[PDB]
Amino acid sequence: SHMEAVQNRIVEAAERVPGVRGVIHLRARYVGQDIWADMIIGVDPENTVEQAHEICEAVQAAVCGKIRRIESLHVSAEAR
Amino acid sequence: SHMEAVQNRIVEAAERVPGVRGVIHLRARYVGQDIWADMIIGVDPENTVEQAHEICEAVQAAVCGKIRRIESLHVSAEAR
Secondary structure (H helix, E strand, O other), rough: OOHHHHHHHHHHHHHHHOOOEEEEEEEEEOOOEEEEEEEEEOOOOEHHHHHHHHHHHHHHHHHHHOOOOOEEEEEEEOOO | OOOHHHHHHHHHHHHOOOOOOOEEEEEEEEEEEEEEEEEEEEOOOOOHHHHHHHHHHHHHHHEEEEEEEEEEEEEHHHHH
């Protein structure tokens, strides 16, 4: 249901959040008309684990705010 | 094939690695006679992402060193 356009939006919205060093992985699927997705973002290896958690939270908020069809979004981080 | 005894060993071995603040989650399965497993360890929220990666690596090494039947082990971290 025009999945690539939604994936583009997800990556674009995540990259606009302070502290994100790219989108490493994104898997999105439709459950009916809703998107369920799992993402890994890059972060500064020198951020604290707490800071990385904060960035992930921020990404979840930004992405879900911008893309109303998302009903589930898990965001994790890795050093980049 | 005496899975609980192997799970106990996995958790015990992970908890002996410097920087581990418990085992948050462990899923192990047999693929034939071999174990494939995925684990989440707790770490100090004030560790850097790099330090958490180092701890995860150390856990993978310690666990696989001690439990020879493990053929695949993924270790991630979360603040605790």
